[PDB]
Amino acid sequence: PFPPTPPGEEAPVEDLIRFYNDLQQYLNVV
């Protein structure tokens, strides 16, 4: 499934960087 949930537009851009970090784990996590 997809554990990480994308941030809203109001969420700080830093959240987007973390999302990419968590998304990277998804690929390695498979």
PDB file of N, CA and C in Angstrom:
ATOM      1  N   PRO A   1       0.854  -1.209   0.000  1.00  0.00           N
ATOM      2  CA  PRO A   1       0.000   0.000   0.000  1.00  0.00           C
ATOM      3  C   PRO A   1       0.883   1.250   0.000  1.00  0.00           C
ATOM      4  N   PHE A   2       0.320   2.391   0.293  1.00  0.00           N
ATOM      5  CA  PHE A   2       1.136   3.637   0.310  1.00  0.00           C
ATOM      6  C   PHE A   2       1.035   4.299   1.693  1.00  0.00           C
ATOM      7  N   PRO A   3       1.973   4.018   2.552  1.00  0.00           N
ATOM      8  CA  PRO A   3       1.989   4.579   3.928  1.00  0.00           C
ATOM      9  C   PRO A   3       2.074   6.116   3.969  1.00  0.00           C
ATOM     10  N   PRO A   4       2.963   6.709   3.217  1.00  0.00           N
ATOM     11  CA  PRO A   4       3.120   8.191   3.191  1.00  0.00           C
ATOM     12  C   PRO A   4       1.935   8.893   2.519  1.00  0.00           C
ATOM     13  N   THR A   5       1.421   9.923   3.134  1.00  0.00           N
ATOM     14  CA  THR A   5       0.282  10.670   2.528  1.00  0.00           C
ATOM     15  C   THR A   5       0.796  12.046   2.088  1.00  0.00           C
ATOM     16  N   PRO A   6       0.619  12.413   0.842  1.00  0.00           N
ATOM     17  CA  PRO A   6       1.113  13.721   0.343  1.00  0.00           C
ATOM     18  C   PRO A   6       0.602  14.896   1.198  1.00  0.00           C
ATOM     19  N   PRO A   7       1.344  15.985   1.290  1.00  0.00           N
ATOM     20  CA  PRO A   7       0.921  17.177   2.081  1.00  0.00           C
ATOM     21  C   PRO A   7      -0.071  18.058   1.315  1.00  0.00           C
ATOM     22  N   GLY A   8      -0.754  18.934   2.000  1.00  0.00           N
ATOM     23  CA  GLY A   8      -1.714  19.834   1.303  1.00  0.00           C
ATOM     24  C   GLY A   8      -0.941  21.020   0.719  1.00  0.00           C
ATOM     25  N   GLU A   9      -1.586  21.848  -0.054  1.00  0.00           N
ATOM     26  CA  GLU A   9      -0.868  23.014  -0.644  1.00  0.00           C
ATOM     27  C   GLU A   9      -0.418  23.958   0.473  1.00  0.00           C
ATOM     28  N   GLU A  10      -1.215  24.099   1.494  1.00  0.00           N
ATOM     29  CA  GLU A  10      -0.846  25.003   2.620  1.00  0.00           C
ATOM     30  C   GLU A  10       0.371  24.447   3.367  1.00  0.00           C
ATOM     31  N   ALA A  11       0.542  23.154   3.370  1.00  0.00           N
ATOM     32  CA  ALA A  11       1.701  22.557   4.096  1.00  0.00           C
ATOM     33  C   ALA A  11       3.014  23.163   3.579  1.00  0.00           C
ATOM     34  N   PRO A  12       3.949  23.411   4.463  1.00  0.00           N
ATOM     35  CA  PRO A  12       5.268  24.000   4.092  1.00  0.00           C
ATOM     36  C   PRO A  12       5.977  23.195   2.998  1.00  0.00           C
ATOM     37  N   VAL A  13       6.756  23.853   2.182  1.00  0.00           N
ATOM     38  CA  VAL A  13       7.482  23.133   1.096  1.00  0.00           C
ATOM     39  C   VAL A  13       8.419  22.086   1.706  1.00  0.00           C
ATOM     40  N   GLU A  14       8.796  22.257   2.946  1.00  0.00           N
ATOM     41  CA  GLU A  14       9.698  21.264   3.583  1.00  0.00           C
ATOM     42  C   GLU A  14       8.974  19.927   3.632  1.00  0.00           C
ATOM     43  N   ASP A  15       7.685  19.964   3.817  1.00  0.00           N
ATOM     44  CA  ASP A  15       6.911  18.703   3.864  1.00  0.00           C
ATOM     45  C   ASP A  15       7.056  17.982   2.524  1.00  0.00           C
ATOM     46  N   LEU A  16       7.070  18.722   1.447  1.00  0.00           N
ATOM     47  CA  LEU A  16       7.211  18.085   0.109  1.00  0.00           C
ATOM     48  C   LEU A  16       8.556  17.362   0.047  1.00  0.00           C
ATOM     49  N   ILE A  17       9.597  17.972   0.553  1.00  0.00           N
ATOM     50  CA  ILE A  17      10.929  17.300   0.525  1.00  0.00           C
ATOM     51  C   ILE A  17      10.836  15.990   1.309  1.00  0.00           C
ATOM     52  N   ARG A  18      10.251  16.029   2.475  1.00  0.00           N
ATOM     53  CA  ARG A  18      10.114  14.789   3.288  1.00  0.00           C
ATOM     54  C   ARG A  18       9.272  13.769   2.522  1.00  0.00           C
ATOM     55  N   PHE A  19       8.234  14.213   1.865  1.00  0.00           N
ATOM     56  CA  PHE A  19       7.387  13.255   1.102  1.00  0.00           C
ATOM     57  C   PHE A  19       8.272  12.522   0.096  1.00  0.00           C
ATOM     58  N   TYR A  20       9.104  13.244  -0.604  1.00  0.00           N
ATOM     59  CA  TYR A  20      10.012  12.586  -1.580  1.00  0.00           C
ATOM     60  C   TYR A  20      10.889  11.591  -0.823  1.00  0.00           C
ATOM     61  N   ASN A  21      11.333  11.968   0.345  1.00  0.00           N
ATOM     62  CA  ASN A  21      12.182  11.057   1.156  1.00  0.00           C
ATOM     63  C   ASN A  21      11.391   9.786   1.478  1.00  0.00           C
ATOM     64  N   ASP A  22      10.171   9.939   1.921  1.00  0.00           N
ATOM     65  CA  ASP A  22       9.342   8.749   2.242  1.00  0.00           C
ATOM     66  C   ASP A  22       9.035   7.983   0.956  1.00  0.00           C
ATOM     67  N   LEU A  23       8.763   8.686  -0.114  1.00  0.00           N
ATOM     68  CA  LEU A  23       8.463   7.994  -1.398  1.00  0.00           C
ATOM     69  C   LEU A  23       9.672   7.148  -1.799  1.00  0.00           C
ATOM     70  N   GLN A  24      10.855   7.663  -1.604  1.00  0.00           N
ATOM     71  CA  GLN A  24      12.066   6.877  -1.960  1.00  0.00           C
ATOM     72  C   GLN A  24      12.049   5.577  -1.160  1.00  0.00           C
ATOM     73  N   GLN A  25      11.652   5.646   0.083  1.00  0.00           N
ATOM     74  CA  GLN A  25      11.597   4.409   0.912  1.00  0.00           C
ATOM     75  C   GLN A  25      10.614   3.425   0.270  1.00  0.00           C
ATOM     76  N   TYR A  26       9.524   3.920  -0.254  1.00  0.00           N
ATOM     77  CA  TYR A  26       8.521   3.031  -0.903  1.00  0.00           C
ATOM     78  C   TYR A  26       9.186   2.200  -1.997  1.00  0.00           C
ATOM     79  N   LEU A  27       9.925   2.833  -2.862  1.00  0.00           N
ATOM     80  CA  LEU A  27      10.595   2.080  -3.956  1.00  0.00           C
ATOM     81  C   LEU A  27      11.554   1.044  -3.366  1.00  0.00           C
ATOM     82  N   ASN A  28      12.389   1.438  -2.440  1.00  0.00           N
ATOM     83  CA  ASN A  28      13.323   0.456  -1.824  1.00  0.00           C
ATOM     84  C   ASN A  28      12.500  -0.537  -1.009  1.00  0.00           C
ATOM     85  N   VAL A  29      11.471  -0.047  -0.382  1.00  0.00           N
ATOM     86  CA  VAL A  29      10.587  -0.915   0.438  1.00  0.00           C
ATOM     87  C   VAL A  29       9.825  -1.875  -0.478  1.00  0.00           C
ATOM     88  N   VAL A  30       9.397  -1.402  -1.618  1.00  0.00           N
ATOM     89  CA  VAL A  30       8.648  -2.280  -2.561  1.00  0.00           C
ATOM     90  C   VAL A  30       7.537  -3.012  -1.805  1.00  0.00           C
TER      91      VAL A  30
END
